[PDB]
From a paper:
Glycylpeptide N-tetradecanoyltransferase 1, commonly known as N-myristoyltransferases (NMTs, EC 2.3.1.97), are universally conserved eukaryotic enzymes responsible for a major post-translational modification (PTM), myristoylation (MYR). NMTs are thought to transfer a C:14:0 acyl-CoA (MyrCoA) exclusively to the N-terminal glycine (Gly) of specific substrates. Here we report a series of high-resolution HsNMT1 structures co-crystallised with MyrCoA and reactive substrate peptides. These structures reveal snapshots across the entire catalytic mechanism including the reactive intermediate state, thereby providing the high-resolution map of MYR reaction chemistry.
HsNMT1:MyrCoA:X represents a snapshot of the peptide substrate prior to nucleophilic attack on MyrCoA. The free N-terminal Gly2 (aa2) of peptide X is hosted in a cavity (pocket 1) built by the side chains of Tyr180, Tyr192, Asn246, Thr282, Leu495, the C-terminal carboxylate of Gln496, and the myristoyl thioester of MyrCoA. The extended peptide conformation and Gly2 positioning orient the Gly2 peptide bond antiparallel to the MyrCoA thioester, with the amino-terminal group at ideal distance (3.4 Å) from the reactive MyrCoA thioester carbonyl (CM1). This carbonyl lies in the so-called oxyanion hole formed by the amide backbone of Phe247 and Leu248 (equivalent to Phe170 and Leu171 in ScNMT). At the active site, Gly2 is constrained by three sets of H-bonds. The first set anchors Gly2 at the active site through direct interaction of its amino-terminal group with Thr282. In the second, Asn246, Tyr180 and Tyr192 interact with the aa3 amide nitrogen via a water molecule (wat1), ensuring correct substrate orientation toward the catalytic base C-terminal carboxylate of Gln496. The third set of H-bonds between Gly2 and the Gln496 carboxylate are mediated by a second water molecule, wat2, at the end of a 22-Å-long, 544 Å3 solvent channel connecting the active site to solvent. The HsNMT:MyrCoA:X complex was obtained with a long NMT construct bearing the N-terminal B′A′-loop. Interestingly, the B′A′-loop is fully ordered and partially folds as an α−helix in this complex.
Numbering used by the authors:
A (entry chain A): 105 to 496
B (entry chain C): 1 to 8
């Protein structure tokens, strides 16, 4: 795999060349499907290597959810230097995998026939996506995982082909997804930035280190935050705020070129606060009207091979809508709330309007690009600031 | 999936 576009240019994509996506080399000047909708779909699951079987995961069974948690906790995405690994909690996985419209067969697992050991996974959830001037029912693909012992044995193309078939069976022919690797072919490239909240811990674990020109004392002072947020009438989102959060979000996203289109039920699901999953705060002003909101989700990571520090508590910027409060004060209160809640770092991408506040609010640029992709949709690429979609 | 990032 290639994280850089440099190394990607020097690569051949035996699998991705067979798929309906534009080549890495060409530039796209059209808008529409790479290939037409299929009117007959393969009825049989693709063949797995001998010894392995498909199994749709009922995440409502606490034991099956636990197996999925353990598979991801041990085999999911790591940083470049194999220092950190995502540690999605069981309850988070329920939030991300059972939004409105979710289907059991779209939680696509692979098991060992003898042991029943879950060794592979991929998922789809449905979502209406707005891309330039078109609104399409698509799926979001996420959590593509192959066990470390099964790696490099051609299993990931099978999982991709099998989730495609199951999606095609439901009448859907486009998908959106992200990855840290360069693949054919990104619709846009975003970059993670990080805002230190607990800088001591971040340096001891080598998520960060000191500037040569700054001491630990200075570094702590530079990242010191106030104890309480500054914005008047900031408060956690409540049931009564669902219509207006939906309204503010819908109008705010119209300025970008790749966005979700959410029903009001989807807004409840994605934004209604769940402890250790998703936080949303609204701004109710002096007239009683909600004019702004901020949101971030909770995604800790395992710290591998460390005798003292085992986990890194990370908050991830989600959707932040401003119409009266300045965005920079909105994100300043997000940092304070994340600090108050015990987070060690606050992550945000450079998409939407985030660049206007990243340097001012003392974020440091990360080493990982997040690539955005459409499947079976040909359209021009776009700068990060036009991307208005945040996955988990 | 997502992608893990760290500083630099
Ligand atoms: C990512 C993962 C599932 C791929 O499995 P693998 O055994 O290493 O790769 P395989 O031998 O099965 O096949 C390689 C093919 O899969 C492709 N591939 C690799 N990572 C991919 C990704 N995130 N998304 C889509 N395709 C990917 C490769 O591009 C390659 O196709 P190509 O020949 O056209 O280049 C596996 O490495 C894994 O579980 N990693 C940890 C979690 C992770 O990174 N998940 C994906 C998040 S985007
Ligand atoms: C993160 O886990 C993303 C891994 C993405 C794998 C690419 C699969 C994309 C195609 C999905 C099927 C499309 C159905 C129309
Ligand atoms: Cl389920």
């Amino acid at each position: 795999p290639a994280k850089t576009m440099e190394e990607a240019s020097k690569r051949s994509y035996q699998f991705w060349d067979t798929q309906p996506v534009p080549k890495l080399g060409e530039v796209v000047n059209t808008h529409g499907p790479v290939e037409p909708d299929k009117d007959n779909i393969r009825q049989e699951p693709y063949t797995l290597p001998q010894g392995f079987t498909w199994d749709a995961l009922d995440l409502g069974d606490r034991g099956v959810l636990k197996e999925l948690y353990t598979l991801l906790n041990e085999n999911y995405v790591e940083d470049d230097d194999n220092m950190f690994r995502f540690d999605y909690s069981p309850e988070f996985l329920l939030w991300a995998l059972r939004p409105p419209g979710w289907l059991p067969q779209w939680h696509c697992g692979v098991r060992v026939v003898s042991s029943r050991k879950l060794v592979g996974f991929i998922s789809a959830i449905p979502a209406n996506i707005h891309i330039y001037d078109t609104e399409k029912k698509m799926v979001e693909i996420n959590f593509l995982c192959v066990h470390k012992k099964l790696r490099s044995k051609r299993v990931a193309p099978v999982l991709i082909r099998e989730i495609t078939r199951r999606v095609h069976l439901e009448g859907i022919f486009q998908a959106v997804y992200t990855a840290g690797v360069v693949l054919p072919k990104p619709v846009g490239t975003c970059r993670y930035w990080h805002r230190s909240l607990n800088p001591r811990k971040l340096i001891e674990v080598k998520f960060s280190h000191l500037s040569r020109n700054m001491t630990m004392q200075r570094t702590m002072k530079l990242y010191r935050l106030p104890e309480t947020p500054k914005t008047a009438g900031l408060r956690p989102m409540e049931t009564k705020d669902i219509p207006v959060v939906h309204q503010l979000l819908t109008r705010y996203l119209k300025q970008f070129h790749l966005t979700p289109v959410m029903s009001q039920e989807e807004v409840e699901h994605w934004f209604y606060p769940q402890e250790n999953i998703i936080d949303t705060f609204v701004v109710e002003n002096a007239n009683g009207e909600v004019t702004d909101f901020l949101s971030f989700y909770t995604l800790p990571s395992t710290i591998m091979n460390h005798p003292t520090h085992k986990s890194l508590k990370a908050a991830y910027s989600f959707y932040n809508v401003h119409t009266q409060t300045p965005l920079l004060d909105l994100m300043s209160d997000a940092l304070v709330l994340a600090k108050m809640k015990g987070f060690d770092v606050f992550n945000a991408l450079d998409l939407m309007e985030n660049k206007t506040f990243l340097e001012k609010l003392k974020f440091g640029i990360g080493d990982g690009n997040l690539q955005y992709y459409l499947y079976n949709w040909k359209c021009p690429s776009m700068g990060a600031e036009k991307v208005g979609l945040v996955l988990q | 999936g997502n992608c893990f990032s760290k500083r630099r």
